[PDB]
Ligand binder design. Structure first.
Ligand SMILES: CNC(=O)N1N=C(c2ccc(N)c(Br)c2)c2cc3c(cc2C[C@@H]1C)OCO3
Ligand SMILES: CNC(=O)N1N=C(c2ccc(N)c(Br)c2)c2cc3c(cc2C[C@H]1C)OCO3
Lengths: 340, 85, 50, 95, 50
């Protein structure tokens, strides 16, 4: 950037978006930075707008192109265009390779119900060798259980050791067949992507930003699923809320898959395609929101810019831009590490 | 989707503002939950999750347990005719 | 259509699932989107395990 | 002779039962795991098509820095060659 | 198939189509995305009519 100047100093999704808008409108533009840096805030005592919203009402700017959430309080002062990118509150969790060694993973080939059902046939056949021929007969039937299914001259005892032989045959062939099915393909496999499943358990914690639109969504929500999510985070110790967005993403990474963070899907989908490539958006979003472009009330560029965005989305331009700075220019190494 | 009003209509901007109010107060998502999920005929077909089970099923192993006990029972029937002959 | 009954006066407001398109924005005033959507995939979930 | 098959005393009889279930899992864990390296041996390209060369990033690929070859992928509107050009254009280090 | 647009476009056993006349079909027509244009060129030449 030090070796560059003008509008070519910056790059990003909004940078290309400003060029397309100006192309269909036919005016020259200049890319300026907001002073205070924090946009869309109105003080409760002084009632003075700050950020980029205050630069349009106070005439310090003509148009604003940036990820600005469309809210009702901002619509009463400036003009908002139609949304150019949809999003919503999503769930971000670390991708569990699993890669889950242990003893619970040894009895994994057979199911939890077969390991506990084979023993019912063991003691069932060793107790038949009692009947076909107690401290020496169980001592014998166990000596007749190890070596297939001793001294059985009666025809009654001959077919007991034969069917038990075919019975243990299918079990040991089954143990080998499925035990190869997970050294060949690993899902593997958890967890659930939905949000209602994330609330019904307390093993893995979850929280939102300490102050923002995300926390206020659950506070006044009158839906059954989301209210139980609010009564948890309100009485969840320690503090499940983070100070900034950079601290919430850094808390899911150092939690061994035991902490989740709820945030917008645009930021969530962007982190998934960035190093170290571990976060993965799971399940649909929770609410419906979108960004937009702002112009002053009664300005000469309000309606002309609104009509230009609808021409961009229809020709497939916006989705081509979303696919540009998210997945094409993404440093996703998990698409190359999960297939190797 | 959206609500449409004629160009330069009086009730144009008031309805536009009135949609943002219902959205943030959650009245839109609550009504969406009303005529879709709540009054829905498959409200149960939306909670059960279908995942890839890791372990091997018990049902196929059942076909082996029903042929073993089917042999144990046939074995105790021959044990009695051999005890009399 | 409903857009016609707004430009032609036979009604005052049209409330329905009305897709927000550019060709309709030039002739009528659209509110903010009260319901987001997109083209999706419908498949019969198996129903393969017997 | 107890090691080869399965594993007159109750003490040794349960040495017979338990030595088998241990060697039974190992031979299965040998058999099951060995099938995974032969099924992965069937995952060779080997030798694939020019398109599949672009679908993976383990083996890198590039052309000359300036010539009739590099320009081909640039203005090729074909989806396969365009995916190749987008990779080589931003692949670091310089391919 | 896994839930995705490309897994629907990578195979051709489970076919797929849209409505004959509507904003759905016109999407894939003028779409300049690699994954979608592949789906368009499939259904545009798919027989029998999907
Ligand atoms: C007809 N096969 C058969 O009778 N066997 N097959 C066996 C067998 C079973 C499955 C496979 N894949 C292989 Br290789 C060999 C078998 C496996 C054992 C074992 C003993 C046997 C002997 C048995 C019942 O102790 C440790 O694991
Ligand atoms: C390092 N080992 C390992 O990661 N596994 N052990 C695998 C494993 C487990 C037991 C044996 N005897 C062998 Br060989 C390999 C494994 C076995 C499974 C299974 C998944 C796995 C994958 C993981 C849990 O589903 C059903 O059976």
């Amino acid at each position: 950037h030090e070796m560059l100047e003008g509008n070519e100093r910056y790059e990003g999704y909004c940078v290309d978006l400003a060029a397309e808008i100006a192309k269909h409108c036919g005016f020259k533009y200049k890319l300026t930075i907001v002073g205070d840096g924090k946009y869309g805030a109105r003080d409760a005592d002084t009632k003075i707008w700050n950020g980029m919203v205050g630069e349009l009402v106070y005439g310090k700017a003509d148009i604003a192109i940036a990820p600005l959430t469309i809210t009702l309080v901002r619509e009463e002062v400036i003009d908002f265009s139609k949304p150019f990118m949809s999003l919503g509150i999503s769930i971000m969790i670390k991708k569990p390779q699993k890669s889950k060694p242990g003893v619970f993973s040894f009895l994994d080939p057979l199911a939890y119900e077969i390991w506990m059902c084979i023993v019912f046939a063991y003691i069932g056949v060793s107790v038949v060798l009692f009947l076909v021929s107690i401290f020496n007969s169980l001592w014998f039937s166990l000596g007749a259980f190890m070596q297939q299914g001793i001294s059985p001259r009666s025809l009654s005892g001959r077919i007991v050791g034969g069917v038990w032989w075919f019975f243990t045959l299918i079990i040991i062939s089954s143990y080998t067949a499925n035990l190869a099915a997970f050294l060949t393909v690993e899902r593997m496999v958890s967890p659930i992507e939905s949000a209602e499943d994330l609330s019904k358990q307390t093993e893995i914690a979850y929280g939102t930003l300490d102050s923002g639109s995300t926390k206020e969504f659950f506070r006044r929500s009158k839906i059954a699923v989301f209210d139980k999510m609010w009564t948890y985070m309100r009485s969840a110790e320690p503090s499940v809320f983070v100070r900034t967005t950079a601290e919430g993403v850094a808390r899911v990474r150092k939690s061994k898959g035991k902490y989740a963070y709820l945030l917008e899907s645009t930021m969530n989908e962007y982190i998934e395609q960035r190093k170290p490539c571990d976060t993965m958006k799971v399940g649909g979003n929770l609410d419906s929101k979108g960004y937009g472009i702002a112009t002053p009330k009664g300005s000469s560029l309000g309606t002309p810019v609104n009509l230009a965005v609808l021409k961009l989305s229809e020709q497939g331009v916006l989705d081509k831009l979303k696919n540009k700075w998210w997945y094409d220019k993404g440093e996703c190494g998990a698409k190359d590490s999960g297939s190797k | 989707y959206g609500i449409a009003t004629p160009k330069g209509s009086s009730l144009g901007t008031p309805v536009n503002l009135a949609v943002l109010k219902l959205s943030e107060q959650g009245v839109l998502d609550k009504l969406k939950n009303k005529w879709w999920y709540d009054k829905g005929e498959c409200g149960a077909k939306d909670s059960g999750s279908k995942e890839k089970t890791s372990a091997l099923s018990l049902s196929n192993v059942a076909g082996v347990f029903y042929i073993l006990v089917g042999g144990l029972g046939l074995a105790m029937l021959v044990a009695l005719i051999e005890f009399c002959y």
